[PDB]
């Protein structure tokens, strides 16, 4: 019932970068599709709150493990490919509308832990070059990823 | 509107496209449409910058010709690519790691905004050229019609035979070129270089390429001329090379070390085209 009138579920996505300009790439549990962490907004939370909660529960990072460098101005939408829509579940979710955050990891790599949850959606991670996600992400997310990585590049590039 | 740039490097005209932040698919039909100077943009070659395939590389790029086929010539367009990703803010690195149809390269953008390329270590073993000779000498004699000539030969990946000339304008490129290009002692032909030594760190050069003749810029020929001039004890380890197409700077500490070629890339224009 967070689903908008259009059928878009509000979501946050997270781009975590290190000092060298790599970004964190997470493996989805029990699969080999990779992606940036993303998660639903719950009833009553802001974007930022949902982001910090997803960040801790799926990546194991606390508010002091990172700093927010940037966030997307407006929402980015993607439609799920028609075959992926659960039509029988009312109200129907036909897509996601996302606010994206760029975070810098300010503490060491050992602070990451993808098993802080016992229902973890990600079972692995690695550092990849900044643009590698735009190619490797699943096709129906690529447009959003292109726009997000475009918006964030200046901030990340201004890390000497 | 698809954004693009026009750039000039190694004496060639590139249309250069950011396909990292832009969603575009370069089918051979689109490419031929773009190559058309009245319907599209017009270019010698099309350089497309793409996200990398390998998480430890920064980019991938492809080169297409006007027929819409992908070209795989080693190091082709590397200077324009490196300057381009910097100009467009796709990266801020000075050492850019990139894959191409020919493999992986590391390109360095100098503080003068030239681009330096590792070309590998030259090879003078005649089997590797391949060259008909019993052992490697710093200089070889060859008969060429009525003439006798002295030459160095080396492999930069492809074969080269380099002659010291006293002036590249008073050099019979047009007559000696073809004769040495397909001479008996080159099983796979060879690029013939004509090298006027001005100073130990400044060469003028004209190159009669393998099966192509005179081109304004053959970077591997500049690498080759400098490599033999150094092996022969004639050149400093840092040589400016003046070709019809412009200027390259070669650097090489000699055997055991790789040879570096440095060259410019000119940003000519930006442009938009609707597809
Ligand atoms: Cl792509
Ligand atoms: Cl170039």
């Amino acid at each position: 019932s967070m689903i908008d009138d259009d059928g878009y579920r509000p979501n946050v996505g997270i781009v975590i970068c290190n000092r060298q300009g790599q970004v964190m790439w997470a493996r989805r549990f029990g699969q080999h599709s990779w992606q940036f962490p993303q998660g639903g907004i719950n009833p009553g939370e802001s974007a930022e709150q949902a982001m910090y909660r997803e960040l801790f529960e799926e990546v194991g990072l606390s508010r002091k493990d990172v700093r927010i460098l940037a966030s997307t101005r407006n929402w980015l939408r993607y439609k799920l490919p028609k075959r992926l829509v659960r039509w029988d579940t009312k109200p129907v979710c036909i897509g996601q509308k996302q606010k994206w955050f760029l975070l810098q990891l300010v503490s060491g790599d050992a602070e990451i832990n993808m098993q802080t949850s016992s229902t973890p959606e990600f079972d692995g991670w690695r550092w990849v070059s900044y643009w590698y996600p735009v190619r490797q992400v699943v096709s129906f997310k690529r447009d959003v990823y292109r726009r997000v990585m475009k918006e964030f590049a200046s901030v990340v590039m201004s890390l000497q | 509107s698809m954004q693009f740039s026009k750039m000039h490097g190694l004496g060639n005209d590139f249309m250069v496209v950011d396909a990292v932040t832009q969603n575009v698919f370069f089918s051979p039909e689109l490419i031929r449409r773009l190559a058309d100077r009245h319907l599209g943009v017009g270019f010698d070659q099309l350089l497309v910058v793409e996200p990398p395939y390998d998480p430890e590389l920064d980019f991938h790029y492809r080169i297409f010709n006007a027929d819409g086929s992908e070209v795989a010539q080693c190091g082709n367009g590397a200077r324009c690519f490196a300057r381009f990703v910097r100009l467009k803010g796709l990266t801020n690195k000075r050492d850019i790691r990139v894959s191409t149809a020919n493999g992986r390269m590391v390109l360095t953008v100098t503080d003068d905004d030239l681009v330096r390329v590792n070309m590998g270590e030259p090879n003078f073993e005649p089997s590797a050229v391949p060259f008909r000779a019993n052992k490697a000498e710093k200089t070889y004699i060859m008969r060429a019609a009525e003439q006798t000539i002295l030459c160095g030969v080396v492999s930069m990946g492809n074969p080269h035979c380099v002659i010291q000339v006293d002036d590249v304008d008073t050099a019979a490129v047009e007559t000696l070129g073809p004769v040495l290009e397909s001479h008996e002692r080159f099983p796979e032909r060879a690029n013939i270089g004509f090298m006027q030594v001005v100073k130990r760190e400044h060469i003028r050069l004209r190159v009669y390429e393998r099966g192509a003749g005179e081109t304004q810029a053959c970077g591997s020929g500049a690498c080759a001329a400098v490599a033999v001039g150094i092996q022969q004890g004639l050149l400093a380890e840092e040589v400016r090379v003046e070709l019809p197409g412009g200027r390259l700077d070669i650097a090489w500490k000699g055997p055991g070390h790789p040879l570096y070629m440095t060259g410019p890339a000119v940003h000519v224009y930006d442009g938009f085209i609707h597809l």
Side-chain angles (χ1 to χ4, degrees), chain A residues 20-22 126-132 134-136 142 146 149-150 153-154 156-159, chain B residues 18-24 50-60 62 89-93:
Chain A
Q20 327 156 73
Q22 300 170 295
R126 63 161 306 162
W127 292 116
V128 300
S129 67
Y130 182 89
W131 298 107
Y132 175 85
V134 171
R135 180 180 298 278
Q136 303 301 327
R142 185 160 306 122
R146 207 181 301 278
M149 301 308 279
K150 175 177 175 64
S154 47
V156 171
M157 293 335 135
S158 297
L159 273 36
Chain B
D18 162 14
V20 171
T21 66
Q22 298 184 112
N23 182 29
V24 47
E50 300 187 30
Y53 288 94
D54 178 311
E56 280 141 354
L57 303 184
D58 299 306
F59 299 95
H60 183 80
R62 299 194 150 89
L90 299 177
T91 184
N92 62 343
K93 302 185 187 197

Side-chain angles (χ1 to χ4, degrees), chain B residues 168-247:
Chain B
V168 312
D169 309 275
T170 190
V173 177
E174 307 77 352
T175 206
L176 215 176
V179 182
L180 280 203
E181 180 237 9
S182 50
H183 182 292
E184 176 248 303
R185 295 175 71 192
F186 294 130
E188 300 177 1
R189 284 189 206 211
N191 308 285
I192 313 304
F194 301 116
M195 171 174 67
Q196 164 185 7
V197 182
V198 177
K199 315 94 177 197
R200 288 231 319 154
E201 55 283 308
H202 182 197
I203 268 67
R204 297 188 68 224
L205 173 66
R206 257 209 291 161
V207 186
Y208 191 99
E209 290 192 37
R210 193 162 49 162
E214 314 79 20
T215 298
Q216 329 286 338
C218 171
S220 77
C223 305
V226 170
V228 316
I230 279 173
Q231 177 90 332
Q232 289 178 342
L234 279 61
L235 303 182
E237 86 185 42
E238 223 158 270
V239 182
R240 146 187 199 202
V241 188
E242 284 298 344
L243 298 136
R247 153 173 191 177

Side-chain angles (χ1 to χ4, degrees), chain B residues 75-145 147-208:
Chain B
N76 194 16
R79 281 133 308 270
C80 294
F81 152 81
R83 280 253 294 135
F84 177 83
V85 290
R86 283 179 65 90
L87 274 36
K88 291 306 157 161
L90 299 177
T91 184
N92 62 343
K93 302 185 187 197
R94 285 207 177 278
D95 298 82
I96 304 147
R97 316 179 100 83
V98 63
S99 60
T100 70
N102 300 109
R104 308 145 96 92
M105 315 188 281
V106 183
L107 309 171
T108 303
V109 180
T110 74
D111 321 283
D112 277 321
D113 289 345
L114 309 174
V115 174
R116 174 172 104 236
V117 176
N118 188 331
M119 304 290 285
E121 179 176 359
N123 192 335
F124 305 86
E125 209 46 51
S127 65
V129 176
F131 176 52
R132 214 62 94 202
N134 323 83
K135 67 161 211 77
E137 317 268 0
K138 301 148 55 160
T139 305
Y140 306 90
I141 313 152
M142 312 220 302
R143 285 283 316 179
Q147 273 263 291
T148 171
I149 66 89
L150 289 157
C151 78
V153 316
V154 65
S155 167
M156 290 299 310
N158 42 352
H160 303 260
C161 183
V162 180
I163 314 292
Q164 193 163 357
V165 153
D166 281 2
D167 182 292
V168 312
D169 309 275
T170 190
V173 177
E174 307 77 352
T175 206
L176 215 176
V179 182
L180 280 203
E181 180 237 9
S182 50
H183 182 292
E184 176 248 303
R185 295 175 71 192
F186 294 130
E188 300 177 1
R189 284 189 206 211
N191 308 285
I192 313 304
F194 301 116
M195 171 174 67
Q196 164 185 7
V197 182
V198 177
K199 315 94 177 197
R200 288 231 319 154
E201 55 283 308
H202 182 197
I203 268 67
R204 297 188 68 224
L205 173 66
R206 257 209 291 161
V207 186
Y208 191 99

